[model samples]
Target: GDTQEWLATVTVEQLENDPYPIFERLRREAPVAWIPAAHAWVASTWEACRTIADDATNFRGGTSPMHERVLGTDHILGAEGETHQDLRAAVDPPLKPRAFRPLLEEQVRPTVRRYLEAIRGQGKAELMADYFEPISVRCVGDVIGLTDVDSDTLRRWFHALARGIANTAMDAEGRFTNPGGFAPADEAGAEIREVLEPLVAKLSAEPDGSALSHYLHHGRPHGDPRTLEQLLPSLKVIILGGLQEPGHQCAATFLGLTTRPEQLKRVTEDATLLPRALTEGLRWMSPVFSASSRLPLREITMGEATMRPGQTVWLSYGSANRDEAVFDRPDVFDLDRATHPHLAFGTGRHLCSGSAYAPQVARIALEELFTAFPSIRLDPAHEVPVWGWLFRGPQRLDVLWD
Candidate 1:
């Protein structure tokens, strides 16, 4: 009763900023419980969240009011059945490492090096602002064919985009909650359409060496190319993908390491261990707490909770990553400790399609940071991190180099 009340009373703002404590209590007591306030069922344990997410036939994606009102059913994020499959198929092949790795490295590495060079002269720097965010934005921009747009304008568009995505998790009233974010998302979408709306006019114009161009010309369903209207939601979500997750997650990876010297030293001495480091880091502090959610079409059972046909359910990526039953020393950040099948990038068919690149970028960022600065250590005087519902990473990573 206390746990249910605690979960129900916890404000949306608190969950937005940090849901871990609420999640911890929920997982320990009722791993799967209904929050009367949100009018949603939550899966708080590893097995339950995994089972719900993996069972697409039962827990369907793109069911939120946020998706219905703004993103619509056409976009992959919200699309289901064949439409979702088609959209995802069209976008998936080109993103594979065989094709994408070269593109990513070419665009991302030089900019990363350039930024590191600029900051190398200074003994200290704020990593998130100076390096991580800029690198992620610039690199992902090149991929998405937004190179012509100014960085500030792109920043504004993506800022609105992220807020729009986050609004999905906000207070759900009747149908919609954060209608405020929807307006800005509309504005941002208009701005984006203005910039790239001419692509239809350039029919048969050949690939412009951008991911968007490729998606336009050679992506899934193998049908006629999609119109701007058809492709807008797809592209916008991709931009949000590019703009949001990597930088935040990478910052979390660094925080995971910088806070622990032994693990850091092990990785520094042997670079191959970096992958292991990143893996554990993601498990320790998941970059994304929750993303896509579902609503059942029929009455369903998940762990201790039973859901009604129309009831909403959220996939708890955060709680599952730290499930006491799954992880050893659940709170400890140990690079040597092997953890498989982490839900950090999510799980199941609706899982994050772009899990690979963020960690690679993070690994690259770590490599360059170490090379340039040699001995960068966290500044004790500064606060550690401030994260939110959809993102968890260092807000201000104050560090000094030897």
Candidate 2:
């Protein structure tokens, strides 16, 4: 218990640089150990996390009511039980395995290639800005049928709202207070509605080949015919969900690959390995580190800790990814590693809708990058990536080539 209390003492920089070691220590201590600073029990082992994820009766999805204040009630990510299912079922299909694969191949891959092609002449570029962020955001925009919209606006709004969302993560003065950016989120939301509402109305009236059009017409399974306002918050969830994971995951994927040349070389030699390699990269460096504030509904017994009717649990997916029992050499990054089980995208009822799309995006992005810049690598002088828990991604990836 005292060990995790040390979390409050650890500076953000130290935690961000190398957190896995701390997570590893927790895993060794207890499956569900109390972190006093966090005021929550952490599920550090894979089995414990999977159990917490599966037992919907005892455990609830990790969405705080504070999120509802920021994202609204229609935000499915903040909703549990029936509301969650309806929102998920409505806009979720286009991102499904069978459906999204074709979508990515036709729409997303070309965009990625288009961006890669444009940057080809540069010979060197920061992959995060030039390659990952733009391709990921624009592709999600296109998927959401905002092709006519400005990429920068979509980018800014996504981040502003996200920062607003993230600001609610910390507890302040017995009430969740906005760390800042609430006004920015509100402004961005209203501005996006200025553009998005009419677009939704137009889409609802007419059928288009786009996924946005599909969702607008008849996406809600649980609610009655929704107004543009009702759907807007939910749509923001979908839009942000689509954009956030892939860009960061893509950054982490390339970071893992380029650092391991022999492994990165395998992808160029054999295209088939690209998917499996990226799959392992997801497991190796989980983009989403922890799912927090999962409250026990009644009472729950987990590992060394027994929970009351209302208590918090933070499931450490980063630790589960490195769980020694399930994974061989959990610390080593091996693309060919056979077993790839992880809690990165979560599980049970609240599993990420963009689950399949993220890896697919990373794979496509990687394929395009390797093909375009065969010699591309992390800038030798640039400091390496240091992604902390809760949010994970390379803040900057300066890649160069001849």
Candidate 3:
């Protein structure tokens, strides 16, 4: 396909730098372009991409070897058919609208305020590592009933786990290599797992109202009860992946708002605009760099090209969310955009289970930040925005409040 030819010329690093232009080119040239070099094809437009996501029988989530290797076979993320439905049923109750809402307003909101207060007296703070990361770590940790270690340690461990699982270069045998390239990330995962084991054990022994406790005791109450060993890795994956993406994304949102003084002022002036501002921030600086791979179950035509079975197809959320056909003035940031569905949390069966919770955390965190320090401004000299294709944000956002 035309995409295969384009893939030959485009390096992964180049795609990582700015995939939007590449996606645009694909949408115009070959919307369902196949990349032989990477042994994959990408769905570049909103309609085609959304179609791929919504069709579960034609395209399965865990079809990619990379996902299976990273998340393991037992994870709900990779499960399909009845297994997926069962897993979702088991997990969805606690995260349902009513359940998570009170948890957010009561538990999460106060946590945001407490953390903001802790940093309020600092005068100057690095938002990424100092504030947002801690808030995320503590919030997720609390949800999982994490104890014995404070939020800072949990944040470091979370980063390590996320980096370890992030997609990287593939070997000749189609195995993925570590991005850290023999760094301590693997060891860090082991260490973090060790810490989590005891915590899971304690939670299992005495059922707390925490999500971890719920998962351990009730996630598979009917058939084939999942043991602690079976549950811990999945739990860690969820906790780590959950915290890192939204945490960094929330931090990125703060950086963007504070950097753009006019936008910040508008949001502060009209608190009702907070939700829109939050959505806009997510659209502008999406945390996950790329979409999960969807392998076609059979030969299927999408857009201008036909895809064969076993070929990996990536749904580019970053590209589709900005498709000019669907979104007006796609490249520009508009906080007032009407309620339109975005591919940020993905679509269809594989949509992020934590989708509702993530935005709430970001909105609450941003609301607290603005309410506590309305005069906050980005320290331009020290601000450093992260650059990567798969994920993008501020690695460290230095801010000062007058």
Q: For all candidates, what are the clash counts? A: 1, 0, 2
Instruction: List per-prediction Cα lDDT, in the order shown.
Output: 0.71, 0.70, 0.69
Angstrom error of the Cα, residue 9, model 1: value is 1.2
Clashing pairs for predicted structure model 2, backbone only: none
For lDDT, the strongest prediction is 1
> Per-residue lDDT for 22-133 in model 2, tens only?
7787788778866443445678888888888777777776554435645665566545787676667667777778777777778888889888986787777777777788
* TM accuracy, model 3: 0.87
lDDT of 3 at 55: 89
Worst 10 residues of 1 by lDDT: 168-177
lDDT at residue 244 of model 2 (Cα atoms): 66
Q: Write the per-residue lDDT of candidate 3 for residues 1-402, one digit (tens) a residue.
A: 545565778766666666667777876677577654344677777787788888887877634544444445466655678867766654666656677788788788888888788787787888887778888877767765564568877787766555544455565455655444424455655666777777667766676666666676665554444466566546655666677777876875666566567887988777677778777767766676454557777888866668877666877776777788888876666766777877878888888777777778778888888887888887777837565555555678888888
lDDT of 1 by residue, 81-128 (tens): 877776776577665677668865676778789889878877688988
Compared with the true structure, the alpha-carbon lDDT of candidate 1 equals 0.71
